């Protein structure tokens, strides 16, 4: 009935920053701009949500407290706590329909919206569970996040496939023009399961990975995924639909293998991109014995040409690509040498780190 708690500033800041992650869109339901604060038994729970996903932080209450719930503006409450001095004791209490924040001789009275109006994701039971290092989840997402579509009619492409198979966790992202797939062993036998996480949920999952050694405990249900890292619980609804099969998109029999230094290739594509068409980003690749030539032309008839010494012994061929798709892959690989496997001018190209097969990229060419 009369929520109250006193908590040291640094036990509140990162939690407040974490639970504010899903907020920031266009104003819809007023309470979506607020954080839900709940004091129950010895815990302060803070929740932020955008209806599709939510982030919850549990903070242990060692100092006197009284139970109850309310919601307050997220940015203002975080800005008050952030603006207070290091070591400030932040005393919070509900006073009628106002939430009072006090520390030293600083006093803030915030407007509130009822906790009964706060959107809670519907009840669900997990069917799959596994625990993995945060570094493995970071690796999986960073290797493939850039290939997800942005607002494609096929809503299942505006997200990332998370697939468990044997002892591996795998991510797949594609927009139908380019595809990225990454697989990592996670040291435990898993059922074969596939879910599509919304792109915003993928970005939220990445943000919650502090880099430390608290493990990431994942729970997957029929329609939701939950990720537990320390005292933070991230939940998101899943995306419906049939995601494409990366096994059927990987080029069948590349008869042409190219190998070059990742950085020399990245810089050559980066420079050629400067004089490519700003909307269509088209570059031509001319592969010949131990040589890769990249050309770029734009509507001003400006032209970039880059010649590289590469390892290549297949047949001579020309193939056009969107340079942003090629650069996204090279930027994501950040290795010493890269391998490009081709078939012909109208077929996809597989690109990968020459020293590792954990991630694979498939880029479809342009008729150029």
């Amino acid at each position: 009935s009369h929520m109250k708690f006193t908590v040291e500033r640094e036990h509140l800041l990162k939690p407040l920053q974490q639970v504010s992650g899903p907020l920031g869109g266009r104003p819809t339901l007023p309470i979506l701009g607020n954080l839900l604060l709940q004091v129950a038994d010895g815990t302060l729970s803070l929740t932020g949500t955008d209806l599709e996903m939510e982030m919850v932080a549990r903070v242990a209450l060692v100092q006197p407290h009284e139970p109850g719930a309310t919601t307050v503006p997220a940015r203002k409450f975080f800005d008050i706590c952030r603006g207070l001095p290091e070591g400030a004791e932040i005393a919070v209490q509900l006073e009628g329909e106002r939430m009072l924040v006090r520390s030293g001789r600083s006093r803030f009275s915030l407007s509130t919206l009822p906790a009964a109006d706060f959107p809670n994701l519907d009840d669900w039971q997990s069917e799959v569970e596994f625990t993995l290092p945060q570094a493995t989840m970071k690796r999986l997402i960073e290797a493939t996040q850039f290939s997800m579509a942005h607002q494609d009619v096929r809503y299942y492409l505006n997200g990332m496939l998370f697939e468990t198979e044997g002892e591996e966790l795998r991510t797949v992202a594609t927009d139908g023009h380019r595809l990225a797939v990454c697989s990592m062993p996670i040291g435990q036998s898993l059922p074969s399961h596939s879910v599509i996480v919304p792109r915003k949920g993928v970005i939220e999952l990445m943000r919650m990975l502090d880099g430390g050694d608290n493990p990431l405990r994942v729970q997957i249900g029929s329609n939701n995924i939950r990720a537990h890292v320390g005292d933070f619980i991230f939940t998101s609804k899943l995306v419906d639909g049939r995601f494409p099969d990366y096994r059927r998109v990987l080029p069948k029999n590349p008869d042409k293998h190219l190998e070059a230094g990742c950085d020399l290739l990245k810089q050559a594509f980066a420079r050629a991109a400067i004089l490519s068409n700003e909307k269509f980003r088209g570059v031509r690749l001319y592969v010949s014995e131990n040589q890769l030539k990249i050309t770029a032309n734009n509507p001003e008839q400006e032209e970039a040409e880059e010649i590289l010494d590469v390892t290549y012994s297949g047949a001579e061929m020309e193939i056009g690509f969107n340079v942003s798709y090629v650069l996204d892959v090279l930027n994501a690989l950040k290795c010493e040498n890269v391998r490009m496997m081709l078939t012909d001018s109208v077929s996809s190209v597989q690109i990968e780190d020459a020293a590792s097969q954990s991630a694979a990229y498939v880029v479809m060419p342009m008729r150029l």
């Binding site: 139908g176 023009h177 595809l179 494409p244 059927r248 998109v249 269509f280 498939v362 479809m364 342009m366």
Partner: peptide, 6 residues
């Protein structure tokens, strides 16, 4: 034109 993976 950009080709599609499928």
């Amino acid at each position: 034109r950009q080709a599609x993976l499928f």
